[PDB]
Each structure stands twice: as structure tokens, then as C-alpha cells.
Amino acid sequence: VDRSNFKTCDESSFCKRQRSIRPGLSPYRALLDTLQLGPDALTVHLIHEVTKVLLVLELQGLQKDMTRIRIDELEPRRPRYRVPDVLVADPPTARLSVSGRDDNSVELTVAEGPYKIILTAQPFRLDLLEDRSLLLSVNARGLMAFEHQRAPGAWEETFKTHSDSKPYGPTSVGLDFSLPGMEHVYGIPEHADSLRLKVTEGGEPYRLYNLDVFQYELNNPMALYGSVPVLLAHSFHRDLGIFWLNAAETWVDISSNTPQTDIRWMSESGIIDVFLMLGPSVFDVFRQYASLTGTQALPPLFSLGYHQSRWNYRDEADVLEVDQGFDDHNMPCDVIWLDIEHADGKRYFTWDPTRFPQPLNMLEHLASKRRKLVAIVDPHIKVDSGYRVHEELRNHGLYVKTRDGSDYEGWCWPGSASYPDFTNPRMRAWWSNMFSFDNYEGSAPNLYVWNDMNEPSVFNGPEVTMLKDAVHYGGWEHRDIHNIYGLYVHMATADGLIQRSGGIERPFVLSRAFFSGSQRFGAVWTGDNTAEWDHLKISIPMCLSLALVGLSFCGADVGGFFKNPEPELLVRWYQMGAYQPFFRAHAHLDTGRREPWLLASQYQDAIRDALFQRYSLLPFWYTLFYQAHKEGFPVMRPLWVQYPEDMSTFSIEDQFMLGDALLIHPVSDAGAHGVQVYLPGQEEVWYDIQSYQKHHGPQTLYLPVTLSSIPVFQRGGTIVPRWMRVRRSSDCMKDDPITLFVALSPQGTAQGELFLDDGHTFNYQTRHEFLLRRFSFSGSTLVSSSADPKGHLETPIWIERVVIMGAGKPAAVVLQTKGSPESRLSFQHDPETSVLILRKPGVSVASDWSIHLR
Amino acid sequence: YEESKPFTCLDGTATIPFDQVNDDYCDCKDGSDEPGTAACPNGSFHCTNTGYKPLYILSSRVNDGVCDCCDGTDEYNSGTVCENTCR
Numbered sequence: 001v002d003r004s005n006f007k008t009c010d011e012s013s014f015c016k017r018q019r020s021i022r023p024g025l026s027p028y029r030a031l032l033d034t035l036q037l038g039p040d041a042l043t044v045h046l047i048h049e050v051t052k053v054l055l056v057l058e059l060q061g062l063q064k065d066m067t068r069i070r071i072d073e074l075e076p077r078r079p080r081y082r083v084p085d086v087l088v089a090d091p092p093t094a095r096l097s098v099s100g101r102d103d104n105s106v107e108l109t110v111a112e113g114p115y116k117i118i119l120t121a122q123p124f125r126l127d128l129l130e131d132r133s134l135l136l137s138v139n140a141r142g143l144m145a146f147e148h149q150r151a152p153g154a155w156e157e158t159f160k161t162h163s164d165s166k167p168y169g170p171t172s173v174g175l176d177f178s179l180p181g182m183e184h185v186y187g188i189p190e191h192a193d194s195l196r197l198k199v200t201e202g203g204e205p206y207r208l209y210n211l212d213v214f215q216y217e218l219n220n221p222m223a224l225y226g227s228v229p230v231l232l233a234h235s236f237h238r239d240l241g242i243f244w245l246n247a248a249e250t251w252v253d254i255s256s257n258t259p260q261t262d263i264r265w266m267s268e269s270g271i272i273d274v275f276l277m278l279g280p281s282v283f284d285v286f287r288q289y290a291s292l293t294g295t296q297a298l299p300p301l302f303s304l305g306y307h308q309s310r311w312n313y314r315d316e317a318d319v320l321e322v323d324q325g326f327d328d329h330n331m332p333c334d335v336i337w338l339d340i341e342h343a344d345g346k347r348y349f350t351w352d353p354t355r356f357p358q359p360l361n362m363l364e365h366l367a368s369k370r371r372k373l374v375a376i377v378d379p380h381i382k383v384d385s386g387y388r389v390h391e392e393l394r395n396h397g398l399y400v401k402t403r404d405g406s407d408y409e410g411w412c413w414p415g416s417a418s419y420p421d422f423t424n425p426r427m428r429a430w431w432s433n434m435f436s437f438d439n440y441e442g443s444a445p446n447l448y449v450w451n452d453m454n455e456p457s458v459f460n461g462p463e464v465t466m467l468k469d470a471v472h473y474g475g476w477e478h479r480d481i482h483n484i485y486g487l488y489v490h491m492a493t494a495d496g497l498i499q500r501s502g503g504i505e506r507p508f509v510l511s512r513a514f515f516s517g518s519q520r521f522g523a524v525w526t527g528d529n530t531a532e533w534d535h536l537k538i539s540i541p542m543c544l545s546l547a548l549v550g551l552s553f554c555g556a557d558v559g560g561f562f563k564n565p566e567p568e569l570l571v572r573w574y575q576m577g578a579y580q581p582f583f584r585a586h587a588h589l590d591t592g593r594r595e596p597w598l599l600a601s602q603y604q605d606a607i608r609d610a611l612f613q614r615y616s617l618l619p620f621w622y623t624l625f626y627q628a629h630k631e632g633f634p635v636m637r638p639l640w641v642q643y644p645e646d647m648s649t650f651s652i653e654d655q656f657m658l659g660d661a662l663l664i665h666p667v668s669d670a671g672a673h674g675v676q677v678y679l680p681g682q683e684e685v686w687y688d689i690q691s692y693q694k695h696h697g698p699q700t701l702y703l704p705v706t707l708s709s710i711p712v713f714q715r716g717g718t719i720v721p722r723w724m725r726v727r728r729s730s731d732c733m734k735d736d737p738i739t740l741f742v743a744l745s746p747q748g749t750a751q752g753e754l755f756l757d758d759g760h761t762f763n764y765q766t767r768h769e770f771l772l773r774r775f776s777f778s779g780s781t782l783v784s785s786s787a788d789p790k791g792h793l794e795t796p797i798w799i800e801r802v803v804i805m806g807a808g809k810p811a812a813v814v815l816q817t818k819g820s821p822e823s824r825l826s827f828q829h830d831p832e833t834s835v836l837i838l839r840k841p842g843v844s845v846a847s848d849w850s851i852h853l854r
Numbered sequence: 855y856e857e858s859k860p861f862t863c864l865d866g867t868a869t870i871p872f873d874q875v876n877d878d879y880c881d882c883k884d885g886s887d888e889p890g891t892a893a894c895p896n897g898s899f900h901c902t903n904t905g906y907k908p909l910y911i912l913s914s915r916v917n918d919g920v921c922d923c924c925d926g927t928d929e930y931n932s933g934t935v936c937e938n939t940c941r
């Protein structure tokens with residue numbers, strides 16, 4: 001990357017102003033005479049001691065142990081930006097009470113305890129407590145800064161050749177937070193950086209500004225394509241979260257100091273609007289944040305399969321050759337992707353008239369293999385009087401505008417292009433209607449969508465994005481809205497895929513740019529990575545930092561986007577991607593073709609093995625995503641989420657968990673002969689799912705590997721459902737029987753869940769047509785019961801096999817299910833591995849049943 | 855009255871009763887007990903395909919909803935009705 005195109009904090013004039021304010025006595029003070037305790041909030045005036053500017057603090061306790069702090073000007077010349085459409089609801093409030101008061105202090109109790117907020121008047125300060133434990137302090141280092149709107153690089157400012165007219169002058173806001181007891185913080189994606197965030201004191205702050213960084217590099221805090229202003233703090237004793245609800249350019253400083261971490265947020269405009277999520281457990285934080293910005297959209301089953309992509313597949317014949325290549329080489333695949341060369345000169349919603357002349361027939365041939373297709377649709381519209389999309393958007397005034405009232409024009413893939421104003425609800429509705437089968441001619445129900453370049457990328461723009469003084473719906477500047485522009489694209493696209501179906505089909509949309517709330521609209525990926533071993537390694541901490549902030553449907557380009565991976569790296573990347581949520585191979589225009597059958601047989605076989613393991617685990621992946629959708633719990637997890645008291649896990653990022661059942665340590669080094677796998681948990685056992693060898697935790701096990709090894713361990717006490725009949729795509733598999741893998745705890749117990757529905761509609765929600773089963777093992781009995789009785793489903797899926805790890809040989813196996821005579825099952829048992837296989841239970845998955853080992 | 859005999863896997867790994875032949879569960883390590891279902895990972899399904907060449911397909915493609923035999927016999931209980939195309 002050429003770093004000179006992108007501002008450092010010093011080159012960002014508001015970052016330079018804010019960051020020059022160093023820790024010290026704050027000039028802000030609360031006028032306790034103005035304090036009012038309102039019906040859902042507390043309001044009190046703040047004043048700058050020197051400027052005498054008057055601010056208003058709106059302090060709120062919220063249900064589910066959360067506090068919200070909002071600060072705005074008392075009498076602004078013009079209203080400041082407050083972020084819309086990100087919060088899924090008005091957060092339910094909890095009542096504040098004054099429980100203490102002196103000359104310089106007011107203590108507030110939230111509802112009836114145990115949470116208390118101490119407002120200090122001079123200097124202005126907030127402390128948050130659970131009883132007498134101090135959880136968090138606000139403005140403890142005096143870094144609060146609120147530039148008031150003055151009379152219309154502090155004003156006019158230039159970077160390279162681009163001039164920001166800056167008609168409103170300095171308006172930046174900033175605020176600090178002190179986390180006593182915390183030494184590990186996480187989150188604020190997206191950065192090609194480690195899971196555990198580094199202190200910024202001697203360098204750049206972490207930057208949050210959706211930007212298109214060409215050939216981005218590793219281990220640095222430059223802003224990448226998406227921004228989620230959510231920071232998580234973990235210690236042995238508690239978990240906390242900070243949600244800084246601002247859409248403008250934001251810099252984040254992190255400092256360490258009895259152990260304590262301080263966090264400072266610095267944003268260019270808008271109000272101060274921050275949520276304090278008090279835990280105490282990390283799953284409490286997940287729930288708290290989920291109640292604010294929603295949960296992960298339930299992906300249609302096919303989108304959890306394998307995606308085959310590149311820039312670019314040539315033509316319909318090429319797409320069909322790729323399709324047939326998967327079947328001829330016995331490799332599963334659900335979706336083939338069409339990048340920008342499938343359209344007419346990068347006019348989106350069109351098809352190249354020579355190379356894609358009959359898209360319906362291409363889509364019909366894919367439907368006959370029960371596979372899907374994804375087409376790219378970017379949000380920049382070619383300036384072209386013959387382009388109907390451009391004419392309609394121009395005629396209806398739905399483009400982003402410059403200050404002089406003309407439509408903004410930049411440069412992108414089709415050359416000169418304009419940018420629809422997706423902050424305008426009328427534009428988003430137009431966009432969604434454009435995906436109807438009549439408007440998007442050539443599309444069909446098995447065609448889904450990829451939104452790229454939606455930061456927005458502008459090739460001739462400052463930092464390769466839109467001018468700060470472009471103008472959006474309701475007069476707001478682009479500097480106000482920048483970081484939710486991509487989310488609005490992702491949202492309008494996803495709604496369009498729903499509406500074109502009459503509200504029945506679940507969408508699938510991959511998006512490059514994102515914000516808080518993007519989890520509600522589909523998937524994201526880490527952009528243009530590189531075919532190198534270190535880029536393979538960094539996919540884990542990048543997707544883990546996205547998982548912690550609610551974006552569970554994450555992945556990285558398998559094989560790397562830039563450059564050509566050596567076959568061994570490609571094999572290891574398939575094994576890595578096979579255990580990450582979003583699983584797509586993608587490649588740059590000038591790379592050699594790397595469809596997985598083009599390699600020598602030894603590499604083909606290891607890739608096929610990784611693809612089979614992924615397809616077998618789809619019932620498990622699907623259930624984890626249903627839990628993500630209902631509860632807000634991440635699918636891919638850091639080990640410290642499952643072992644919060646094991647401080648040796650707080651920084652691990654070459655290992656991760658899927659739910660609570662599977663621990664993954666993929667090989668990520670060329671020519672490796674083994675890996676060091678940390679198996680955590682006291683009194684915890686782990687099963688090598690390839691050899692069935694049981695290992696007790698906690699230990700670091702040295703595990704030898706070959707080209708075909710994917711180090712995966714099942715936790716004792718868990719039950720993992722698999723489809724052992726791998727077919728060519730997931731649609732072919734979704735009525736097939738389930739095999740249950742029971743990993744016995746040392747106490748001889750195990751538990752697990754399973755979600756099932758039709759695989760693609762909202763019927764699970766609108767008609768309660770689904771199954772949520774609970775499987776539980778204790779004593780010597782495996783029992784299937786309903787984990788949600790409201791769910792019923794017509795399905796042929798049955799239980800064809802049970803594999804129990806850690807069991808002795810029984811004398812007899814007996815199955816009982818309601819409505820059937822008591823049955824005896826035959827079994828096989830290996831005394832070396834203590835693996836018990838129950839043959840063909842033959843019971844419907846919708847039925848209660850029990851199996852007893854005598 | 856006299857009775858019936860059992861089935862022996864073609865690899866010789868086992869002998870099972872004939873009511874476990876094509877019972878939709880894999881009992882032979884070579885897949886030979888399920889020539890008519892999708893139960894074995896290493897099995898094969900024989901397309902007779904009168905009017906064209908006969909063909910073997912993977913067991914995983916029996917009732918996957920995709921027409922693999924030109925005579926359509928691989929899809930007999932999947933919801934996909936295949937037409938004869940051996941012409």
C-alpha cells in the first residue's frame with residue numbers, strides 16, 4: 001500500500017486538535033442547579049470554564065444493565081447528526097434515583113440497584129459502580145472535547161489535491177473512559193491487526209473510516225473497509241463493552257497504566273452518544289449489544305456451503321464448465337460467482353451481450369444442479385445517458401450532490417460514475433425495487449448479490465473515497481454519514497432480495513463495507529488479502545474481532561486475492577476456510593486459475609477432504625447460526641470467551657472455537673511437521689476427531705501433521721450433529737439423515753442442540769415451521785427432546801447413527817420412542833479408542849426418543 | 855418348511871442378513887450392501903439406460919434431486935421427476 005494517500009492523525013486536522021489535548025484537569029463542569037430527573041432520563045447542563053459554551057448531558061440507565069450517555073450543545077446554530085437506523089429499537093429505560101448529594105457530587109441509583117452512577121460536578125466526571133465496585137469512569141483523564149459550531153486546516157483544508165470546503169468549521173467531539181482492572185481490550189474492526197488490541201501511545205490511534213486500501217499490509221492500525229465502534233474489555237473478574245454510536249471519522253486511542261486500560265474516542269462531527277454495557281459476563285455483553293443493534297441474520301443454508309469465485313469467469317460456458325468440474329472431481333460446491341466482468345461495461349444490473357447472452361438459461365442449468373449464483377452489484381452508477389439506471393436516478397434527484405447542487409461525479413470501474421444517496425429512504429426503496437424479477441431482467445430466485453466498493457470507493461477521491469463536503473438527504477454532509485453508507489447499500493440490497501420474492505425468501509448479500517448493525521443484513525469478508533502465509537494467519541484475529549462485535553458471518557478470500565499461492569498454501573487455506581463462517585475462494589484478474597481440481601492429486605485430495613468436513617458439519621454450522629440469530633452469541637469464538645478465567649488464552653489467535661463444542665488449530669506454516677495445540681479447561685477432556693484419542697486439559701499438546709491434517713478437537717460434554725452423506729451441494733443434503741457425535745464429559749454427560757427448517761424461507765418465523773431439538777446424555781441414556789415446542793416441521797430427516805466417544809462396551813442397546821414398540825439396536829465398539837457406534841436408530845428427528853445403554 | 859440365506863460383502867469383511875441389503879444404512883466397508891440407495895460413501899448406482907450406454911454413478915447422487923441417469927432411475931423418491939433422455 002502507498003501510505004501517503006491516507007491521512008495519519010497528524011494530517012487529520014480534527015484528530016490533531018483532539019489528540020493534542022493531553023490528560024489533565026478538564027475545563028468542563030456540571031451545573032447541578034440545572035439538574036432535572038426526567039421521565040426516562042436525567043438532564044444536566046455542562047459548561048466549558050473558559051469558552052462558557054453550554055452543553056447538555058442526557059444520562060440514562062437502561063434495562064439489561066446498560067447506561068447511555070449523550071452530550072449535545074444546549075443551543076446549537078444547526079442540529080448535530082444523530083445516527084439513525086442502526087438501533088433496532090428505542091432502548092427500554094430504567095429509572096434513576098438520587099441516592100446521595102453534596103456540593104460537588106450526585107449519586108444516582110439505577111432502578112433498585114446494584115448499579116450506581118456518581119456524577120461529579122467539578123471537574124465533570126462520571127463513575128459507574130455495582131454496589132461499591134468501581135466498574136468504569138468517564139472523563140477521568142480530562143480528555144473530553146466538544147467543538148461547538150462556530151459562525152459559518154480547521155476550516156478550509158486540503159489533502160493532496162482535494163480541498164474540503166468545510167463550511168461548518170471545527171465540530172469534533174471526543175471523550176475518554178477508564179477501565180480499572182482491565183488489561184485486554186478487543187474489537188473496533190476492521191484492522192489487519194491482532195485480536196488483542198495494542199496500546200497506541202507511541203504511534204497512531206486505531207482509525208475507523210471505511211476506506212479502500214490497495215494491497216493492505218499486516219500489523220498496522222490503518223482504517224480498512226468497515227468500522228464497528230465497539231470495544232470489549234475482558235479480565236478474570238468481569239467483562240465490559242463500549243459502543244460509541246457515531247458515523248463520522250473516528251480515531252481510538254488506547255493506553256495502559258492497579259492494572260488499568262484507558263480508551264479515548266475522537267470523532268469529526270455528530271453528538272457524543274455512547275453505550276456502556278456492564279456485563280458482567282461476556283455473554284451478557286453479547287446480549288446487551290444485540291438488544292441495541294440486533295442479531296445476525298439467519299443465513300439461508302446454501303450460503304454456509306462452499307463458494308467458488310474469481311475475477312472473472314469468462315462466460316456462460318465457463319460457469320457451466322466450472323459447475324461440471326466440481327461434479328467430475330467429486331467436490332461439493334453451492335455457489336459460483338460472477339464478478340464485474342459479467343455486466344455490460346460495469347453497468348450493474350446488466351449482462352454482457354456476448355459473453356452472458358442468456359442469463360435465465362445459465363441460472364436454469366445451475367438450478368438443475370441445485371446450485372446458486374452470486375452476481376456483483378456495486379453502488380456506483382456509470383454516467384451514461386443510455387444507462388436506464390443512471391437516467392432514472394438522475395431524473396429523480398436521488399444522487400449524492402455537491403454543494404452547488406449538481407450530482408457528484410467520481411471515477412470508478414466504469415469510468416466516470418455517480419453515487420446514489422443511500423441515506424435517502426426513497427433511494428433505498430428504489431434500489432430494493434430494482435431487484436424485482438421484472439426490473440433486474442435476467443435474474444431468477446437462485447441469483448444472489450455481492451455489494452462491493454461500498455465505502456464508497458472513489459478512485460479519484462480523497463483517500464479513494466467521497467469528498468467530505470458532498471451533500472446527502474436532509475442537508476447532512478458526507479463527513480456526517482460516511483461510516484453507514486455501506487450498511488445502507490447492504491440493507492437496501494437485502495430488502496430487495498426479500499421483496500422480489502413476496503417477503504418469503506431469506507436474502508444472501510455479501511458486503512465489503514459495514515457498520516454496527518450490519519450483521520442484520522448478511523455477510524462480510526476481509527477484502528483484498530494476499531496469497532501469503534501471514535495473510536492466512538491473520539484471518540483468525542480479523543474474523544474473531546468481527547465476531548466479538550456481532551458480525552458472525554465473516555471470512556477471508558481462500559487462497560488470497562492478490563498473487564498466486566503455492567499449492568501447499570492453497571491446501572492450508574482451504575482447511576482454514578473450511579472452519580470459518582463465510583467460505584469463498586476468490587482471486588485477482590491476473591492470477592492463474594485455481595479451481596481446486598487444477599492441482600496435483602495429493603493437493604486435490606486434501607482440499608476435497610476439507611470440503612467434505614465442511615459439508616458434513618452444516619447441521620452444526622446451521623444451529624450455531626440459529627443461536628447467533630436468536631441470542632446474539634458469536635459463531636466463531638476466541639478461547640477466552642469459553643475460558644474467561646484462563647489468562648493464558650486472553651491473546652490466543654492461532655486457535656479458535658466454533659460454539660462451545662469444537663476447537664480448531666489449522667496448520668498455518670509451510671512445511672510444518674506438527675502444531676502446538678493449547679487444550680484449555682480444568683477437569684476438561686478433548687477428543688481428537690480424527691483419531692478419537694482423548695486428552696485432558698489444560699495442556700499444550702504437540703500434534704504431528706501431514707498435508708491432510710486439520711487439527712480439530714471436540715469438547716467433552718458436547719453433541720455435534722453431522723450429515724455423513726456428502727452430496728454435490730447443500731440443497732441435495734437437506735432431507736438426509738443425521739449422525740450424532742457424543743463426546744462424553746468425565747462425568748459421563750453431554751448436551752447439544754439442532755435447528756432445522758426448510759433451509760431458505762422466513763417460515764420458521766412467520767409460521768413457526770422449524771425444529772429445535774435438545775440432545776442430552778447422562779447416566780447411560782441418550783435422550784432427544786424439544787428445546788422449543790412452538791416449532792413443528794414436516795421433514796424426512798431421521799437419526800441414522802450415533803457415535804459416542806469415551807464409552808465402554810454395553811451389553812445391550814435399547815431405543816424407545818413414543819408411538820413405537822421398544823427396539824433393540826446393534827452396535828460396534830472399539831476397546832482401544834472407547835468409541836461406540838449405534839447402528840441405524842431409524843427414528844424421526846421430530847420425535848422424542850431415548851436410547852439406553854445396558 | 856425351509857428358510858433363506860444371508861448376504862456376504864464383496865470385500866469379505868462381513869456377512870449380514872438380506873433385510874440389511876438396501877435398507878438405507880451402510881453395513882459393508884466396500885458399499886456393496888446398498889447398490890440402490892445413497893447410504894454408502896463408496897457405493898455405486900447402476901443406470902441401465904436402455905437406448906443409450908449404461909452408466910455407473912456415485913451413491914451420493916441417488917435421490918439428490920439431480921438427474922444423473924438418462925433413464926432417470928437415480929431419482930425415484932426425491933421430488934425431482936426425471937424424463938428419459940437416452941435418445
Ligand SMILES: [N-]=[N+]=Nc1ccc(NCCCCN[C@H]2C[C@](O)(CO)[C@@H](O)[C@H](O)[C@H]2O)c([N+](=O)[O-])c1
Pocket residue numbers: 214310311339340376452459460464527528561586587588
Ligand atoms: N486508484 N486508481 N484506480 C485503481 C484502483 C484499484 C485497482 N486495482 C485494485 C484491485 C482491488 C479490487 N478489489 C475489489 C474489486 C474486484 O477486484 C472487482 O470487482 C473484486 O474482485 C474484489 O474482490 C474487490 O475487493 C486498479 N487497477 O486494476 O489498476 C486501479
Ligand SMILES: [Ca+2]
Pocket residue numbers: 874875876877878879880881882887888
Ligand atoms: Ca445396509
Ligand SMILES: [Ca+2]
Pocket residue numbers: 915916917918919920921922923928929
Ligand atoms: Ca441424481
